[PDB]
Amino acid sequence: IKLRKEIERLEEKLEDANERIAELVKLEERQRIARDLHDTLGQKLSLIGLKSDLARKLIYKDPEQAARELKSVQQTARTSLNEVRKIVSSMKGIRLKDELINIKQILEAADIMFIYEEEKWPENISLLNENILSMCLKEAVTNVVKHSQAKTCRVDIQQLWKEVVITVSDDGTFKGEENSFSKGHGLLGMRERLEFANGSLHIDTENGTKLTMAIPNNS
Amino acid sequence: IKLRKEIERLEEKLEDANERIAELVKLEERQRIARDLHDTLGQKLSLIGLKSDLARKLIYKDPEQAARELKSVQQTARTSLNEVRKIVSSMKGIRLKDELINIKQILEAADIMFIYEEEKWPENISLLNENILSMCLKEAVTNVVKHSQAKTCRVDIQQLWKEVVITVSDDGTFKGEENSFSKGHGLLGMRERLEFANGSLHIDTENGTKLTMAIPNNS
Amino acid sequence: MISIFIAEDQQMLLGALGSLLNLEDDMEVVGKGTTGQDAVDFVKKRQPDVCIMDIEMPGKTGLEAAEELKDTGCKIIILTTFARPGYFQRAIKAGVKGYLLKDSPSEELANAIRSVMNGKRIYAPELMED
Amino acid sequence: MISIFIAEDQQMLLGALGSLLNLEDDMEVVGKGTTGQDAVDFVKKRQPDVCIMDIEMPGKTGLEAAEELKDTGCKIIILTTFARPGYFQRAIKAGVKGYLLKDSPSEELANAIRSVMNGKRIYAPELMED
Ligand SMILES: Nc1ncnc2c1ncn2[C@@H]1O[C@H](COP(=O)(O)OP(=O)(O)CP(=O)(O)O)[C@@H](O)[C@H]1O
Ligand SMILES: Nc1ncnc2c1ncn2[C@@H]1O[C@H](COP(=O)(O)OP(=O)(O)CP(=O)(O)O)[C@@H](O)[C@H]1O
Ligand code: BEF
Ligand code: BEF
Ligand SMILES: [Mg+2]
Ligand SMILES: [Mg+2]
Numbered sequence: 001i002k003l004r005k006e007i008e009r010l011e012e013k014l015e016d017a018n019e020r021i022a023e024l025v026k027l028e029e030r031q032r033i034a035r036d037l038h039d040t041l042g043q044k045l046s047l048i049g050l051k052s053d054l055a056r057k058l059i060y061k062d063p064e065q066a067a068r069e070l071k072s073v074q075q076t077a078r079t080s081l082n083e084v085r086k087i088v089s090s091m092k093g094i095r096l097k098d099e100l101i102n103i104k105q106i107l108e109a110a111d112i113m114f115i116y117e118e119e120k121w122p123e124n125i126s127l128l129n130e131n132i133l134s135m136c137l138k139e140a141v142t143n144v145v146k147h148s149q150a151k152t153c154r155v156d157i158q159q160l161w162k163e164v165v166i167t168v169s170d171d172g173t174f175k176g177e178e179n180s181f182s183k184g185h186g187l188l189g190m191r192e193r194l195e196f197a198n199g200s201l202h203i204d205t206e207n208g209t210k211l212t213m214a215i216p217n218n219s
Numbered sequence: 220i221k222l223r224k225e226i227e228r229l230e231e232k233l234e235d236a237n238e239r240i241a242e243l244v245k246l247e248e249r250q251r252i253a254r255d256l257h258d259t260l261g262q263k264l265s266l267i268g269l270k271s272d273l274a275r276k277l278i279y280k281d282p283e284q285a286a287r288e289l290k291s292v293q294q295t296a297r298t299s300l301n302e303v304r305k306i307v308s309s310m311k312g313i314r315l316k317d318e319l320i321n322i323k324q325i326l327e328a329a330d331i332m333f334i335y336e337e338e339k340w341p342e343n344i345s346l347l348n349e350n351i352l353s354m355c356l357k358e359a360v361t362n363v364v365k366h367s368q369a370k371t372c373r374v375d376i377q378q379l380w381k382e383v384v385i386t387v388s389d390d391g392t393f394k395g396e397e398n399s400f401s402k403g404h405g406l407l408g409m410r411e412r413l414e415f416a417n418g419s420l421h422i423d424t425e426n427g428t429k430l431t432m433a434i435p436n437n438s
Numbered sequence: 439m440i441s442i443f444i445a446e447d448q449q450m451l452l453g454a455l456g457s458l459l460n461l462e463d464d465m466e467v468v469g470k471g472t473t474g475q476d477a478v479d480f481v482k483k484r485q486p487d488v489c490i491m492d493i494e495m496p497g498k499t500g501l502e503a504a505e506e507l508k509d510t511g512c513k514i515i516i517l518t519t520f521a522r523p524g525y526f527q528r529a530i531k532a533g534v535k536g537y538l539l540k541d542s543p544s545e546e547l548a549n550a551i552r553s554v555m556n557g558k559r560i561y562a563p564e565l566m567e568d
Numbered sequence: 569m570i571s572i573f574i575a576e577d578q579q580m581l582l583g584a585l586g587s588l589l590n591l592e593d594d595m596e597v598v599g600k601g602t603t604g605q606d607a608v609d610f611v612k613k614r615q616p617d618v619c620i621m622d623i624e625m626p627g628k629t630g631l632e633a634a635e636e637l638k639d640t641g642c643k644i645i646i647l648t649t650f651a652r653p654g655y656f657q658r659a660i661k662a663g664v665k666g667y668l669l670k671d672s673p674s675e676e677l678a679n680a681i682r683s684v685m686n687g688k689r690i691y692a693p694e695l696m697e698d
């Protein structure tokens with residue numbers, strides 16, 4: 001009865017340790033995304049400094065260009081603070097493999113055919129870059145279910161020499177009107193996240209709607 | 220011989236777990252300082268944006284003031300990037316209790332009397348703020364051993380209603396010459412870290428040298 | 439003319455905000471403070487048209503100061519950097535007229551001050567996320 | 569006149585750096601690239617006076633590109649954001665004339681370009697810490 005009491009006391013503290021390792025393993029992956037953010041905040045802060053140095057030098061030589069540089073400095077600080085907010089809120093970063101699963105189910109529930117010819121999966125992008133691409137792919141199909149009025153949606157995920165490109169095309173009609181990049185909207189927010197990551201967004205509304213989201217590789 | 224082999228196999232995997240908890244507990248304290256940095260980068264990025272908005276509005280109304288604001292934006296980005304560099308390098312943050320121990324031993328090895336009347340220890344400052352104060356207290360006594368030529372050094376650590384103040388006074392002579400805040404030097408670097416934290420540095424060279432390092436409380 | 443009290447703990451920020459609002463032809467900064475207590479002390483004594491107020495300030499906070507100026511008739515706009523749990527709730531419970539992100543453009547802030555003066559209430563979507 | 573090649577992966581940064589150096593009366597940007605390969609391809613063909621070069625660039629890196637232009641006579645200044653293990657070492661082994669922090673003032677960078685052209689070698693203390 002003493003050793004059976006002592007075994008239960010050790011079984012209770014081993015449950016607090018092998019199970020408490022699963023709680024502390026969450027901080028290991030959060031440190032991977034925090035170090036990803038710190039790396040690109042270094043690039044962002046260097047850009048703010050250099051663009052301020054340039055706008056200051058232009059105050060007399062070209063005051064209109066100085067004002068243009070300062071609108072750009074303000075935007076870099078606004079968007080790079082939006083990313084800090086995202087990791088201070090501890091919002092879940094989705095893996096591109098998991099987001100591709102959800103978009104197929106969202107497109108099928110809305111009765112839109114999903115076209116996907118699987119190729120080699122991206123391997124040289126950061127977890128933060130991959131999380132941005134997931135949010136962009138999720139917003140792209142959300143726009144196709146609500147506005148496109150398309151029969152099919154072709155998604156491509158490609159790993160190129162210096163970047164990862166995701167193309168999302170629907171065979172519907174683009175419902176946007178002149179300023180299709182309005183404040184607090186998905187397209188503007190996609191362009192902001194992609195540009196913070198040093199990637200890009202290109203929209204081809206000829207023959208439907210084709211979003212091309214590119215994001216760079218590491219090293 | 221089977222159960223003795225099996226017990227050693229479990230003793231080896233329990234050593235990998237109870238000991239590997241001590242490795243993963245390092246990431247818990249690093250997450251506390253990363254969340255401290257993200258909080259004040261939020262304040263820094265808000266300031267860069269607002270000061271850019273103001274300098275842009277002043278390009279025509281007061282171009283000299285716009286240039287002054289842009290030198291200040293460049294400095295905020297430079298110093299706030301210096302803090303990101305510090306946590307990307309994983310340099311050790313010293314506890315103020317431990318730094319007070321070292322300064323007493325450094326002052327005694329250099330034959331300078333250490334004056335300290337112990338009071339209630341600061342309790343409402345962040346770990347990042349406390350680490351900055353340690354670096355500032357360490358630099359203050361380093362300057363007193365190399366330049367002051369003082370007999371005594373009085374250190375005060377006070378917890379005030381809205382801030383923590385550290386005073387470091389020596390009874391030597393201030394050896395500085397006009398621009399005592401030169402590039403890459405300790406005093407300039409102390410002023411930069413303290414100002415990033417929303418604190419301050421005041422130097423009174425009348426009757427020796429008195430450094431007053433203040434840093435705000437949280438909430 | 440719209441008189442403004444600004445309460446912000448960040449000194450560099452308090453400066454820029456004051457300079458930006460002053461630049462508006464129809465507004466003028468009549469007081470500045472670094473804690474929620476300075477805001478409480480000022481609006482109680484002088485009573486301005488609008489009270490721009492930071493949340494996280496040492497001493498008294500902006501939410502704590504809004505809670506003490508609930509029955510004063512002063513239009514309080516709250517500014518904050520991070521959307522945090524309980525902040526939105528505490529602000530609506532206090533009866534604030536505006537709840538905005540600190541780094542939002544000066545044009546928007548100036549608009550929000552004029553909108554709040556015309557009885558409207560402006561709240562920020564980003565600050566109500568999850 | 570001092571001709572300059574700039575290699576930087578960050579497009580917004582590559583723009584500002586080019587505009588800042590061009591503003592100098594005695595310098596002119598003769599080429600711009602986003603990878604270490606563009607720097608290798610350009611200095612091999614056109615051969616400028618000075619080659620300003622980022623470290624972390626996709627495709628070929630700035631250190632990798634310095635390693636391939638070792639026997640070319642082009643003065644390479646390296647710029648980087650973070651001091652990382654092995655970067656300083658790899659740079660000196662490559663024979664770079666300058667190793668600077670990206671966000672250092674334009675005045676300092678312009679000075680370093682003139683100093684490097686006068687045979688001197690400028691290295692940054694912050695980039696050699698621990
Ligand atoms: N794939 C698509 N096909 C057709 N129209 C599209 C489209 N994607 C976007 N649009 C058009 O562009 C507009 C703006 O898209 P956006 O994603 O920015 O905002 P939204 O209308 O979806 C609200 P939210 O902010 O929640 O995304 C849409 O309202 C629609 O008119
Ligand atoms: N307590 C003190 N008493 C007398 N002179 C002092 C002093 N603290 C600073 N000084 C003077 O101010 C100068 C600048 O101090 P500072 O700390 O910035 O640089 P430093 O000379 O100690 C080299 P480092 O960058 O390693 O600190 C010193 O060289 C000295 O002349
Ligand atoms: F610090 Be305040 F709430 F932005
Ligand atoms: F990305 Be570079 F090395 F600053
Ligand atoms: Mg949308
Ligand atoms: Mg010193």
Ligand SMILES: [Mg+2]
Pocket residue numbers: 446447448492493494495
């Ligand atoms: Mg505050």
Ligand SMILES: [Mg+2]
Pocket residue numbers: 576577578622623624625
């Ligand atoms: Mg780079």
